[PDB]
């Protein structure tokens, strides 16, 4: 029950702040998580799901959101990873850091817009992860369809051709496989 | 190439259906036909031998798994590893079945499946130009079918997002091995 400019607006407003600071990295993660739970609650369609589902969707995607957020602010800082404005870093942390830097290098070369980013951040949450179950998942795919055509509109309003629009949508969703990859390869070392 | 010559090449490149230790053997047998399939994928041989090795090093279980989900699409609640074999592995099987369940609910067409297999290979690692060409192919077939741009976009996106689930399954499975 929302339009394109209405989805980005809801999302941009729900946007968490840029906080300040391995022990550091964890205290920053534990603090970014709380603004994420609120950001998740403010996602158009998320609060609707029951507590057992909302927790699943967040346990499944919290390290991807932390990674895409990180890759977003580090974009204008080539070779560096801006975890916080007071915590700029560089080159199993190192391999993760390289992939993280590669993703950023890419996002910058793609000229990813803040409005296009907040869409991917939501896709990462709704995508990664009885009757209640079969009906919640149906609505989740409904929301994900809304966001696809929100992104397509953003691209259309940005004067891209019909081909460019398709070719960029696939380019962004294909990055979201690598972020899952970095997410999972990171959870490995955490455990 | 062209969008109809693409799907033509892709379908003619398709590996055959072969017939724990049981599956372990089957997997290594299918890895030979997959390297074979990889060479026929338009634009793969153009790459350097180091790239070709690393793409297969990364995609090998994803390629097996997407092929498996395709084989078990018409066999609900079961996994068709081979026609002579229909069945933390309990967790992986559960996730794989859900992918067939999803590909069934979405009516995955063979022409779309061969397109996704090439995307899994070339994306899990000139590569972007070919990836755009396979994108175009998936989009052209949805247009050929007669679907609207709103639905095309929906089908393209909902399909590629299953690729992220395929990596999770790969990662989990590779962790265990
Ligand atoms: C390979 C391994 C060493 C590794 C693990 C994780 C990470 N990530 C990459 C993305 C990212 C993004 C941020 O904004 C902040 C922090 C991070 C860290 C640096 C991060 C995230 C969570 C936690 C702990 C949680 C807990 O136990 O409470 C610690 C560090 C990078 C490398
Ligand atoms: C959780 C974990 C134990 C696990 C790992 C992989 C798998 N996959 C799932 C998809 C799939 C699809 C097939 O067509 C064949 C086989 C398979 C197996 C069953 C498969 C793949 C590779 C190998 C080993 C090769 C080696 O190292 O020699 C063994 C089994 C399922 C579970």
Curated annotation (Swiss-Prot), chain B:
Lipidation (S-palmitoyl cysteine): 115
Superkingdom field: Eukaryota
Domain NR LBD: from-to ranges: 2-177
Mutagenesis or variant effect for residue 77 to V: Destabilizes the receptor and decreases its affinity for estradiol at 25 degrees Celsius, but not at 4 degrees Celsius
Tissue and organ distribution: Widely expressed. Not expressed in the pituitary gland.
Cell compartment(s), UniProt: Nucleus; Golgi apparatus; Cell membrane
Processing and modification events after translation: Phosphorylated by cyclin A/CDK2 and CK1. Phosphorylation probably enhances transcriptional activity. Self-association induces phosphorylation. Phosphorylated by LMTK3 in vitro. Glycosylated; contains N-acetylglucosamine, probably O-linked.
Stretches the record annotates as Transactivation AF-2: 2-177
Sequence positions that bind 17beta-estradiol: 30, 71, 176
Protein task: Nuclear hormone receptor. The steroid hormones and their receptors are involved in the regulation of eukaryotic gene expression and affect cellular proliferation and differentiation in target tissues. Ligand-dependent nuclear transactivation involves either direct homodimer binding to a palindromic estrogen response element (ERE) sequence or association with other DNA-binding transcription factors, such as AP-1/c-Jun, c-Fos, ATF-2, Sp1 and Sp3, to mediate ERE-independent signaling.
Written domain comment of the UniProt record: Composed of three domains: a modulating N-terminal domain, a DNA-binding domain and a C-terminal ligand-binding domain. The modulating domain, also known as A/B or AF-1 domain has a ligand-independent transactivation function. The C-terminus contains a ligand-dependent transactivation domain, also known as E/F or AF-2 domain which overlaps with the ligand binding domain. AF-1 and AF-2 activate transcription independently and synergistically and act in a promoter- and cell-specific manner. AF-1 seems to provide the major transactivation function in differentiated cells.
Family under the similarity heading: Belongs to the nuclear hormone receptor family. NR3 subfamily.
Complexes and interactors: Binds DNA as a homodimer. Can form a heterodimer with ESR2. Interacts with FOXC2, MAP1S, SLC30A9, UBE1C and NCOA3 coactivator. Interacts with PELP1, the interaction is enhanced by 17-beta-estradiol, the interaction increases ESR1 transcriptional activity. Interacts with EP300; the interaction is estrogen-dependent and enhanced by CITED1. Interacts with CITED1; the interaction is estrogen-dependent. Interacts with NCOA5 and NCOA6 coactivators. Interacts with NCOA7; the interaction is a ligand-inducible. Interacts with PHB2, and UBE1C. Interacts with AKAP13. Interacts with CUEDC2.
Clinical condition linked: Estrogen resistance: A disorder characterized by partial or complete resistance to estrogens, in the presence of elevated estrogen serum levels. Clinical features include absence of the pubertal growth spurt, delayed bone maturation, unfused epiphyses, reduced bone mineral density, osteoporosis, continued growth into adulthood and very tall adult stature. Glucose intolerance, hyperinsulinemia and lipid abnormalities may also be present.
Note: Selective estrogen receptor modulators (SERMs), such as tamoxifen, raloxifene, toremifene, lasofoxifene, clomifene, femarelle and ormeloxifene, have tissue selective agonistic and antagonistic effects on the estrogen receptor (ER). They interfere with the ER association with coactivators or corepressors, mainly involving the AF-2 domain.
Designated name of the protein: Estrogen receptor
Lineage: Eukaryota, Metazoa, Chordata, Craniata, Vertebrata
Residues of the full protein shown: 310 to 525 of 595
